[PDB]
Design a protein around this ligand. Structure first.
Ligand SMILES: O=S(=O)(c1ccc(F)cc1)C1(c2ccc(OCc3ccccc3)cc2)CCCC1
Length: 253
């Protein structure tokens, strides 16, 4: 099954789905690179409370995840899967898709990320008290930046991050394997056509994204133990569902 004509159609549909569900246009992020937080604005973030900074980050992550849910809904083959499997895939892969998407908002020249209107370095996040997690996130974006991904490569690669037939809990594992295989063919065909197969060996191991997701859950457990009422009262419901229902409602709209 699936011929060359169908594989190229799948490439274009995935790229279109990605372009339609980007939270931020790449051009918009690039044209903000000179807009960097001053030392006074950096000090201001460092003086913010730990719970205020955690709440802000959980809110920004939840917004980004909402766009990944829309990407999945437009992704060829995804809505054809059962609701159980749609939820299993999003719960395990939404954070991973955001972790890949965020390289677009990272400037490797000065090691800054676009955050709340300006670019700032790791030191902007010191109030969180999760230095190892922040260093891991910046290192991950730095490693992705070195690949010089095109928008089309990010679309195909993030579709594969989401459509992973190895996720525990899948009820129709063979249907997810077939979708994964078609997407793998589309990604590799596009790399072959554009002479970009050299990136294959340089893509991060799957254990790297798993380690970032595990570090996030572990730091959230520590924070939630110190401020349980902050999480209950001020963290987004979708964030608590995924990391501590909403997904079912977003998938039905
Ligand atoms: O702009 S961000 O808030 C940001 C936070 C930390 C960072 F180092 C760089 C950027 C955002 C992001 C939010 C939470 C993330 O992990 C989970 C997490 C980490 C730390 C505290 C709470 C939650 C990762 C990324 C970028 C993509 C979507 C929003």
């Amino acid at each position: 099954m699936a011929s060359l004509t169908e594989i190229e159609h799948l490439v274009q549909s995935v790229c279109k789905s990605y372009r339609e569900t980007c939270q931020l246009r790449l051009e918009d992020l690039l044209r903000q690179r000179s807009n960097i937080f001053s030392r006074e604005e950096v000090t201001g973030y460092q003086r913010k409370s730990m719970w205020e900074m955690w709440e802000r980050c959980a809110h920004h992550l939840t917004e980004a995840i909402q766009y990944v849910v829309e990407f999945a809904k437009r992704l060829s083959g995804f809505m054809e899967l059962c609701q159980n499997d749609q939820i299993v895939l999003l719960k395990a892969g939404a954070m991973e898709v955001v972790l890949v998407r965020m390289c677009r908002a990272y400037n490797a020249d000065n090691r800054t990320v676009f955050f709340e209107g300006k670019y700032g370095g790791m030191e902007l996040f010191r109030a969180l008290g999760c230095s190892e997690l922040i260093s891991s996130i910046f290192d991950f974006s730095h490693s992705l930046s070195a690949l010089h991904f095109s928008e089309d490569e990010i679309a195909l690669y993030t579709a594969l991050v989401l459509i992973n037939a190895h996720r525990p809990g899948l009820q129709e594992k063979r249907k997810v394997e077939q979708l994964q295989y078609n997407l793998e063919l589309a990604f590799h065909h596009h790399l072959c056509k554009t002479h970009r197969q050299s990136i294959l060996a340089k893509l991060p191991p799957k254990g790297k994204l798993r380690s970032l997701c595990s570090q996030h859950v572990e730091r959230l457990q520590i924070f939630q133990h110190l401020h349980p009422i902050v999480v209950q009262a001020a963290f987004p419901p979708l964030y608590k569902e995924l990391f501590s229902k909403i997904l079912h409602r977003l998938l039905q709209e």
